[PDB]
Amino acid sequence: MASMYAKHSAQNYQPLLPGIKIKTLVYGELTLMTEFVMDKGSSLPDHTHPYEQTGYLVSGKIILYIEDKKQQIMAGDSWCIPKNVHHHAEILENSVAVEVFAPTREEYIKYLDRTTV
Amino acid sequence: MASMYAKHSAQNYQPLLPGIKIKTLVYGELTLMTEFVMDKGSSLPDHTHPYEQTGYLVSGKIILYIEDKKQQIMAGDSWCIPKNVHHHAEILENSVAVEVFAPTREEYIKYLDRTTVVE
Numbered sequence: 753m754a755s756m757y758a759k760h761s762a763q764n765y766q767p768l769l770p771g772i773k774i775k776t777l778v779y780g781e782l783t784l785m786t787e788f789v790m791d792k793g794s795s796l797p798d799h800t801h802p803y804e805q806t807g808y809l810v811s812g813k814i815i816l817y818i819e820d821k822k823q824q825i826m827a828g829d830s831w832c833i834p835k836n837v838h839h840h841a842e843i844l845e846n847s848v849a850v851e852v853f854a855p856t857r858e859e860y861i862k863y864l865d866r867t868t869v
Numbered sequence: 870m871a872s873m874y875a876k877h878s879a880q881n882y883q884p885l886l887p888g889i890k891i892k893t894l895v896y897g898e899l900t901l902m903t904e905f906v907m908d909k910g911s912s913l914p915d916h917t918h919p920y921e922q923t924g925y926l927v928s929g930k931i932i933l934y935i936e937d938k939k940q941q942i943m944a945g946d947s948w949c950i951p952k953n954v955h956h957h958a959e960i961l962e963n964s965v966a967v968e969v970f971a972p973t974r975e976e977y978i979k980y981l982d983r984t985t986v987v988e
């Protein structure tokens with residue numbers, strides 16, 4: 753029930769997968785926003801979570817896989833993945849992506865940058 | 870029930886306020902994502918909508934007002950505004966912001982770009 757603000761910082765990024773760093777920026781009662789720093793050559797494995805995922809690529813170049821379909825993602829592109837839909841990605845260059853989850857993905861709250869507000 | 874993708878395009882931006890252009894990128898069952906292009910000197914007036922608003926500043930420099938708090942926002946900063954909370958902003962330089970609303974703000978679906986494909 754309280755609003756928060758997060759300043760851009762290259763620190764407090766926690767390791768999630770080989771070449772993938774994660775950091776929860778802000779969250780509320782219905783959303784949660786994370787930032788992914790993905791190195792060239794890394795990938796996100798296939799997952800199905802009960803959270804809708806809408807994202808935005810800040811920089812870089814990735815390939816997003818939804819079901820069996822593939823789409824090349826560049827700076828400025830966006831996407832929206834519904835609940836329980838198979839999705840994975842392959843990172844072609846050093847990329848940065850912002851991802852929002854609905855509802856509040858409580859397992860990602862532990863990735864808070866500790867600063868916030 | 871359909872996933873979607875939107876390609877970056879400098880077109881399909883509709884005017885919302887003097888100096889403020891809006892474009893709905895994608896939306897789903899619980900969220901809706903828009904992109905705001907804000908000219909230098911413009912501002913967003915005070916509003917209270919029944920939608921949680923979490924945003925990210927792609928570029929520029931603005932001053933975000935949430936309730937009684939004031940904060941200067943620069944590139945890379947983010948925020949989260951709860952439902953029915955007073956908020957407004959003053960745009961200091963040519964800025965671009967991405968904003969997500971929860972639940973799906975159906976009134977902003979009319980700003981959807983033509984370049985959004987399904988799956």
Ligand SMILES: [Cu+2]
Binds near residue numbers: 801805839
């Ligand atoms: Cu996911």
Ligand SMILES: [Cu+2]
Binds near residue numbers: 916918922
């Ligand atoms: Cu608002």
